[PDB]
Design a protein around this ligand. Structure first.
Ligand SMILES: CCCCCCCCOCCOCCOCCOCCO
Ligand SMILES: CCCCCCCCOCCOCCOCCOCCO
Ligand SMILES: CCCCCCCCOCCOCCOCCOCCO
Ligand SMILES: CCCCCCCCOCCOCCOCCOCCO
Lengths: 13, 482, 50, 100, 50, 911, 49
């Protein structure tokens, strides 16, 4: 758990 | 290979393993005590006194106690699942509280010595919880010894039951067949429980809903008074009497708005949690009220005598709150102490006549202090508290001469069951048929003599062990000589 | 991952025109997956060791 | 739960000394159905009284879970083989597939 | 269920039910065809050591 | 004839000394029902089987040597292939796999199962496949119909006209009403109800005639039907050098005869396998699985109007549930209804129940024989059941009280595990001495679990998943239940045998469990027994006699079917404040819970006449039970109302005998016969706290010392023909004296026992050449039963809207005053005019088999043989009961499901 | 074999033929609006000031 750190790239393939 | 299969979905009785289990079992013990130490259980020893007269509303229910019918009182009351009432109901609820308190105390002691509490806060709290459980054990054993063991001033008994007490059980087992312990062992057990519990509880009272040190001092005072030891009853009553002030009011409407309210009463030492949904009950026996529409009808099954009316003088607050001129819609009087509480209504115009349990009050410790101070030979601390109590409650007593104190103790502790204990210590016979009824109520009240006369030292002042006991247990020595 | 498995393969020639067979299998398995990986939380995963 | 049935009939012969043939035809039926049922409870206060029927009973109640899925496949096929003397082999095949 | 045009429950109050549009649908969904040409050459060597 | 009695290798049946009854494969076969113990009614001497419902999903109740305990179970211990089962699990096994079954009745055979073998053990054993050069294939098929037993109780009900006249003259409709004023337009003028509904407003008067007064309706055709049954099975056995196998797949479908649906359908498979790996090791496995579908008729046993046999009897005959073409009109009318009542197929179409069960038994063993006498066996098995049940209530229904639908889904799981390890060494000291020693260990474990969830507030048939319901006040708490137990045991047994005429065996078992108290966890049971063969030693050879053996036995057992959690002081909720939880002790337990001890002594004598044709067996038993489990009312120092402790005693004394015979008259002809008998006398010896007599509340029985448990009711003298009022006897007051005012202080002990004392059954048989004919009869006499429907169907005052009996037409008036039926203003009681005598004699089975002759399969090698049979089940019944079934019931007869009468035709192609 | 498999808890999009169908799709429109015009979607244009 915890706080979510943003700026991910969404995985496709 | 261990083959224990514990039931999922419920707990069972065992030594504790956490602090939350201890706290939850303690709250269940207090919720059990609320249904045991009720006003509804102490009405049967209030009606067996010389201050009531049954009316035509009776159905031979409140009649075996006011008329002293020794054929009905020999095996009275039932304690099955439909109804717990009567003498057997009294015996059942107090032995139930004694066994549950035994289980909680032994489990907490085993969990304290088995070192299952993590920090120091839980250890300190669990030691205070153990002290509260010991106070509840002493209360259960004393309330059984009060009714089922003989006073020393008894003339004729069963042969061998003169110096016997109740069955002193110290562990938890529901299936137990044993003999009656002697009276000295029972009183030493009670006083050792309270002695070990006083030195552990904190000085300042934590909450009114739980056992404090003030309650243990007040209970030790009420035990030392009725035991016949006026030396230490005053020394235990003078430790609480400075901490709870009396009610200050000018008119009897102010007295009935601050007295009936449980939360606003500055006198209660120990009381049970009651609200509009949980913990509230209707103690309508001595008044017999009913909530018709938005007002209250009264149909009592027992009305007081005339000397109880003439004990209260007219400019008293208690003549509008304890006694009420509400019978026959305006004629004589009835006992109206446990009427209602306006904060426990679900809609604030329709009454439902629900009260809460009050276990101790500060008027009783005032009266214990003034009686023990009068009989210890040190009178200058006796006029102070008695004129303070009577001036705070209304009309003032002029001078004290030990019968004004008896009048004050009869006037204050009405509807509580303290009179039948007081007639034995003060050596008062009944004279139920020598007094006169109220002149506003003839035709309503009945006129009948006692089925069995009760002189000083009669055996029937202490109740008989129930019928289901002493048939399954040949080591039980019965009380009455019949 | 934990499993207790069993298997019976059986094959029989009954007579000169028939041949029967069976491949019976079964298991009791307990699975549990670490279901916070693949996302960024604070002290979780290899992102938490870094 | 997944079921399957497969029924084939293969006839293998030799039309001459050095000409081998083989004919196969068949049927196949695959089926599946699955469901998830689920229930929840909240508001427990002791770790021994934690059956699902012992939660709070007001606004602490919730709505169950339920999910159903299913499919099916029907198929027919045929495969022919031919082999010349021992060194030349030809295979032909035709199938028909339907799905839900 | 990827070719149907569907409608699901989206309740508003606790009295009556509501219906929202779920999917658009595709009435002419069919198979995906794949054609494959393969050409292979297998060889052996010194008494099948290679 | 060897019998595995418990563990180890079976010795013989002529050398055991413990009253074993072995039933062969021919009494286990073709059996058109699902419960397999119904086939055993009247076959085993001393075993009493009664199935109390004609439901296809109902299992039998079996008692060996009377009812042993008060307040406990009396079912035996069902073993299937080494590990124990339940009767609902055996219901999913195809009974053409069962090779035999052994009923082990007395406690020299049943004391190595101690703490589970007080009620007897039923030891079922499955086929294993006999070795041959070609394996054999067998194909069974079958088809039958089942309908109701007897339609005699509706021969005494009223007609439409008689009921209407009785209702208008009894003052039910009003004061000044007459016929053709009550039948005219206050009953027939109730198309006001049919006019409110768009499905019925154009159907009244043309196709729907809901009130018909001319000719009365058929309420047996509207509630019961004729229902089919299909079977089918194919099996492959065989074997080879060391290996043997037995595979089978089968199908079963039985639909109930009542209109509200009660089917049962299973698809099952079996593979037994046993191989010899090498010179010392032999391995084996029994694998079994099933997919089952059940449905129960659950409005039976309860009293609703127009439902069951109560609705067959009591529903008035001027209401018509049919339409013009003779189908059911999916609705009917009763007078005074808010909405019209719906029939049974429409109510089944609106309540779609479904239930799929997946069962898998897997059992396996490895046996090692290293040193020529010693064999060491290890056996392990699991038994997993996963059920998944779905009920529904449909929305948008006009004849319902709400237009909203409901749905409920449950999932069940129970897993049983069992491990038994065993070392046996048999040897011979001299030529004239044999000894067999057995040691063993056994662990049994069980774990059960139920989850379940419900929702409501649906408005469409498509959108009815469990998550698409309404929230708020339509939410409920889910369901959750758990049960578990475990046993661990160590046993031992010595067999000793002198020359060939004396056998003596000794048994001992230690048994621990999770159910017993925390103080006494371990139990110790023993047994000793002996068998003396007199016709090998004393009388060596005689002209008429051919065998004579004598046997004695004594052993102690126990009955550990007590609660799973009954010795614990359970702690439940008791809140102080409105936020935090409080807890308090609530049931009190006791740490000294025992296991209902039992001691049994047995003496038996077996004989065989001329060349072993006539054979007889007689057996006497005394079975004593101590420490029975009662929830006794405690003294007031307990702080509780009851405790669940071990108090009491009971003794069952009896005799059972059986006899076989063969009556030839020719070379081809074979005639044979058999008979059983069992008489059992129950007596209570002592109760709890010094007490002499105890009456369980709300049961209607009484436990008195010196008598069996009897009925507890007021006797009924009759009526007084000076005033026409009912009269009951007074307990005591002999002159007897009768009063006309009923009270609860008038009940007494009736000298009629609850459990019937005499049980039996006999059988014939004849076979000319292939063409065989078998007939089996089974009787139970001494059985009393409260007919609860006669409280309603002959009732003078109250429940006046129902149909009544014809004997209410000559009620006592001042004109007709020489009858024995009372005045019409009184309400009947539950006195002894409702005790009926439910002794019967049932033709339980009647089969006609014809094996096709061997000369027909001559120039062929595909088909090996064939067989045809015709069977009838419950064909004929001789009873003085008045209530559709004597057997269906048990201590009281409510709205009951009668047993079925079946006709079955079957084929078998052993190719 | 019929290979027609249709979803559970889902119906087909049809033109409106009743009044209760219009009421059901209107209540669905409002329950869709509640998850659009809620304050969680207007936090982005509030923080940007
Ligand atoms: C539905 C029930 C199907 O369950 C089949 C599972 O059977 C269990 C197989 O047994 C496991 C054998 O391995 C245990 C040895 O460690
Ligand atoms: C003619 C085929 C009949 C087969 C039906 C039997 C189905 C029961 O199997 C259920 C699945 O359980 C798997 C068994 O696990 C194998 C255990 O065997 C290993 C022991 O040697
Ligand atoms: C866990 C359950 C596995 C058992 C499935 C066995 C069913 C196989 O028998 C089907 C044969 O029925 C014939 C139609
Ligand atoms: C062939 C006999 C099967 C052996 C049964 C062993 C059971 C093992 O399953 C353990 C499951 O426990 C769950 C953890």
């Amino acid at each position: 758990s915890g706080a979510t750190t943003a700026t991910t790239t969404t995985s496709n393939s | 290979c261990e083959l224990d299969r514990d039931p999922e979905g419920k707990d069972f009785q065992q030594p504790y393993t956490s602090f939350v289990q201890t706290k939850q079992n303690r709250d269940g013990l207090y919720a059990l005590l609320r249904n045991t130490e009720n006003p509804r259980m102490h009405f049967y020893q209030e009606l067996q006194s010389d201050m009531y007269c049954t009316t035509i509303t009776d159905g031979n229910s409140l009649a075996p106690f006011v008329n002293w019918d020794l054929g009905i009182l020999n095996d009275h009351g039932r304690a099955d699942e439909d109804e717990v009432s009567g003498i057997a109901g009294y015996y059942f609820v107090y032995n139930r509280l004694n066994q549950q308190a035994n289980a909680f105390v032994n489990n907490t002691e085993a969990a304290l010595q088995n070192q299952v509490y993590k920090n120091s806060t839980e250890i300190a709290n669990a030691k205070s919880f153990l002290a509260e459980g010991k106070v509840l054990q002493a209360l259960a054993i004393w309330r059984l010894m009060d009714r089922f063991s003989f006073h020393e001033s008894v003339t004729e008994v069963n042969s061998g039951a003169k110096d016997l007490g109740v069955i002193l059980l110290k562990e938890y087992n529901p299936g137990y067949i044993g003999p009656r312990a002697t009276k000295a062992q029972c009183y030493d057990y009670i006083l050792s429980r309270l002695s070990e519990a006083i030195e552990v509880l904190p000085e300042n009272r934590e909450s009114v809903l739980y056992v404090s040190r003030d309650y243990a001092y007040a209970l030790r005072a009420r035990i030392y008074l009725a035991l016949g030891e006026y030396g230490k009853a005053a020394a235990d009553a003078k430790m609480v009497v400075d901490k709870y002030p009396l009610i200050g009011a000018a008119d009897a409407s102010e007295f009935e708005n601050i007295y009936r309210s449980d939360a606003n009463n500055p006198e209660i030492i120990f009381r049970g949690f009651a609200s509009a949904t949980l913990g509230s009950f209707t103690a309508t026996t001595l008044n017999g009220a009913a909530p018709a529409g938005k007002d209250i009808k009264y149909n009592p099954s027992a009305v007081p005598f005339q000397w109880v009316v003439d004990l209260y003088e007219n400019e008293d607050f208690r003549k509008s709150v304890y006694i009420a001129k509400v019978v026959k819609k305006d004629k004589g009087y009835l006992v109206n102490k446990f009427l209602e509480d306006k904060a426990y209504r679900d809609v604030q115009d329709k009454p439902n006549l629900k009260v809460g349990a009050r276990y101790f009050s500060v008027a009783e410790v005032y009266l214990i202090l003034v009686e023990s101070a009068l009989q210890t030979g040190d009178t200058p601390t006796a006029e102070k508290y008695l004129k303070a109590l009577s001036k705070a409650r209304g009309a003032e007593v002029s001078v004290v001469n030990m019968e004004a104190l008896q009048a004050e103790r009869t006037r204050e502790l009405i509807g509580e069951g303290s009179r039948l204990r007081d007639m034995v210590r003060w050596s008062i016979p009944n004279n139920h048929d020598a007094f006169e009824t109220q002149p506003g109520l003839e035709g309503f009240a009945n006129t009948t003599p006692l089925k069995a006369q009760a002189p000083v030292g009669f055996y029937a002042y202490t109740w008989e062990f129930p019928q289901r006991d002493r048939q399954t247990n040949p080591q039980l020595i019965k009380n009455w000589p019949i | 991952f934990k499993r207790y498995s069993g298997r019976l393969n059986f094959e029989s020639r009954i007579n000169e025109w028939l041949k029967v067979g069976a491949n019976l299998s079964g298991a009791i398995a307990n699975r549990r997956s670490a279901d916070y990986f693949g996302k960024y939380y604070m002290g979780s995963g290899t992102f938490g060791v870094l | 739960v997944s079921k399957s049935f497969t029924n084939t009939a293969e006839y293998k012969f030799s039309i001459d000394e050095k000409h081998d043939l083989t004919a196969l035809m068949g049927h196949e039926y695959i089926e599946y159905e699955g469901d998830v049922i689920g229930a929840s409870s909240k508001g427990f206060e002791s770790d021994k009284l934690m059956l699902l029927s012992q939660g709070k009973t007001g606004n602490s109640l919730s709505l169950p879970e339920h999910r159903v899925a299913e499919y099916a496949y029907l198929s027919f096929f045929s495969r022919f083989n031919y082999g010349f003397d021992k060194w030349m082999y030809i295979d032909f095949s035709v199938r028909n597939d339907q799905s839900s | 269920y990827n070719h149907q045009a569907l409608v699901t429950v989206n309740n508003y109050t606790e009295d009556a039910m509501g219906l929202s549009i779920s999917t658009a649908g595709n009435p002419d969904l069919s198979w995906e065809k794949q054609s494959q040409f393969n050409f292979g050459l297998a060889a052996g060597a010194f008494n099948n050591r290679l | 004839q060897v019998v595995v009695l418990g563990y180890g290798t079976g010795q013989k049946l002529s050398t055991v000394s413990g009253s074993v009854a072995k039933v062969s494969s021919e009494k286990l076969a073709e059996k058109p029902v699902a419960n397999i113990m119904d086939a055993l009614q009247g076959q085993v001497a001393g075993m009493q089987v009664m199935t109390t419902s004609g439901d296809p999903t109902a299992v039998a109740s079996v008692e060996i040597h009377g009812t042993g305990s008060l307040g406990a179970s009396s079912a035996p211990l069902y073993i299937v292939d080494g590990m124990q089962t339940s009767l609902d699990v055996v219901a999913t096994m195809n009974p053409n796999d069962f090779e035999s079954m052994s009923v082990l009745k007395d406690a020299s055979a049943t004391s190595i199962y101690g703490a589970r073998a007080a009620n007897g053990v039923v030891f079922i054993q499955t086929k294993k496949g006999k070795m041959s050069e070609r394996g054999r294939i067998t194909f069974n098929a079958s088809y039958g119909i089942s309908q109701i037993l007897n339609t005699k109780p509706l021969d005494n009900m009223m007609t439409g006209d008689e009921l209407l006249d009785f209702q208008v003259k009894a003052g039910f409709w009003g004061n000044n009403q007459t016929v053709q004023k009550v039948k005219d337009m206050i009953l027939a003028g109730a198309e006001d109800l049919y006019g409110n509904y768009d499905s019925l407003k154009d159907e009244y008067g043309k196709t729907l005639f809901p009130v018909d007064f001319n000719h009365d309706a058929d309420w047996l055709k509207a509630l019961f039907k004729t229902a089919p049954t299909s079977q089918g099975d194919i099996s492959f056995s065989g074997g080879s050098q060391g290996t043997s196998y037995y595979a089978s797949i089968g199908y079963f479908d039985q639909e109930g005869m009542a209109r509200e649906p009660a089917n049962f359908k299973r698809y099952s498979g079996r593979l037994n396998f046993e191989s010899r790996i090498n010179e010392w090791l032999k391995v084996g496995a029994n694998l079994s699985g099933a997919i089952a579908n059940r449905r129960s008729a659950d409005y039976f046993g309860k009293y609703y109007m127009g439902s069951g046999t109560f609705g067959v009897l009591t529903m008035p005959r001027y209401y018509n549930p049919f339409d013009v073409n003779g189908d059911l009109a999916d609705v009917y009318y009763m007078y005074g209804a808010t909405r019209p009542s719906m029939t049974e197929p429409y109510f089944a179409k609106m309540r779609p129940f479904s239930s799929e069960s997946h069962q898998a038994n897997v059992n396996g063993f490895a046996q090692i024989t290293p040193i020529k006498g010693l064999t060491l066996k290890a056996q392990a098995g699991v038994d997993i059941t996963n059920t998944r049940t779905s009920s529904k209530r449909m929305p948008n229904n006009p004849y319902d009280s709400t237009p909203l639908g409901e749905r409920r889904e449950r999932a069940y799981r129970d897993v049983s595990k069992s491990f038994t390890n065993t070392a046996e060494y048999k040897f011979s000291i001299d030529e004239k001495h044999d000894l067999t020693a057995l040691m063993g260990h056994e662990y049994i474990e069980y774990e059960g679990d139920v989850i379940g969830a419900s929702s409501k507030g649906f408005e469409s048939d498509k959108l009815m998943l469990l998550s698409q319901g309404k929230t708020g006040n339509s939410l409920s708490l889910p369901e959750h239940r758990v049960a578990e137990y475990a046993y661990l045991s160590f046993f031992s047994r010595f067999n000793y045998g002198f020359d060939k005429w004396m056998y003596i065996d000794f048994s001992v078992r230690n048994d621990q469990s999770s159910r017993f108290g925390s103080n006494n966890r371990s139990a110790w049971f023993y047994s000793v027994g002996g068998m003396f063969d007199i016709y090998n030693k004393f009388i060596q050879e005689s002209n008429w006699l051919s065998d004579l053996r004598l046997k004695m036995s004594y052993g102690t057992t126990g009955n550990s079917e007590i609660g799973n959690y009954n010795h614990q002081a359970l702690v439940t909720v008791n809140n102080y404040t409105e936020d935090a939880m409080g807890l308090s002790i609530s049931t009190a337990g006791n740490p000294d819970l025992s296991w209902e001890k039992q001691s049994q002594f047995n003496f038996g004598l077996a004989a065989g006449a001329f060349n072993n044709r006539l054979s007889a067996e007689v057996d006497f038993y005394v079975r004593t039970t101590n420490d029975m489990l009662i929830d006794v009312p405690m003294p007031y120092i307990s702080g509780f109302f009851s405790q669940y402790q071990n108090v009491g005693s009971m003794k069952n004394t009896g005799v059972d005998l059986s006899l076989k015979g063969t009556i030839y008259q020719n070379k081809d002809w074979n005639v044979y016969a058999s008979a059983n008998f069992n008489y059992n006398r129950q007596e209570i010896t002592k109760l709890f706290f010094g007490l002499n007599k105890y009456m369980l509340p709300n049961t209607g029985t009484i436990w008195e010392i010196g008598y069996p448990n009897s009925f507890y009711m007021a006797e009924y003298a009759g009526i007084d023909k000076k005033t026409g009022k009912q009269l009951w006897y007074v307990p005591g007051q002999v002159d007897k004296v009768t009063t006309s005012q009923y009270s609860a202080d008038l009940e007494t002990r009736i000298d009629k026992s609850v459990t019937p004392p005499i049980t039996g059954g006999f059988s014939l048989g004849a076979s000319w050449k292939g063409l065989s004919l078998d007939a089996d009869f089974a009787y139970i006499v001494g059985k009393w039963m409260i007919n609860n429907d006669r409280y309603f169907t002959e009732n003078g005052g109250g429940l006046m809207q129902l149909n009544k009996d014809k004997m209410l037409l000559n009620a006592w008036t001042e004109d007709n005053k020489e009858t024995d039926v009372p005045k019409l203003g009184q309400s009947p009681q539950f006195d002894t005019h409702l005790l009926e005598n439910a002794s019967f004699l049932r033709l339980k089975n009647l089969k006609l088999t014809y094996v096709l002759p061997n000369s027909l399969f001559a120039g062929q090698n595909v088909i090996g043989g064939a067989r045809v049979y015709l069977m009838a089940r419950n064909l004929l019944t001789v009873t003085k009961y008045k209530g559709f079934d004597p057997e269906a019931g048990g201590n009281v007869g409510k709205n009951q499901y009668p047993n079925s009468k079946q006709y079955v035709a079957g084929i078998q192609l052993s190719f």
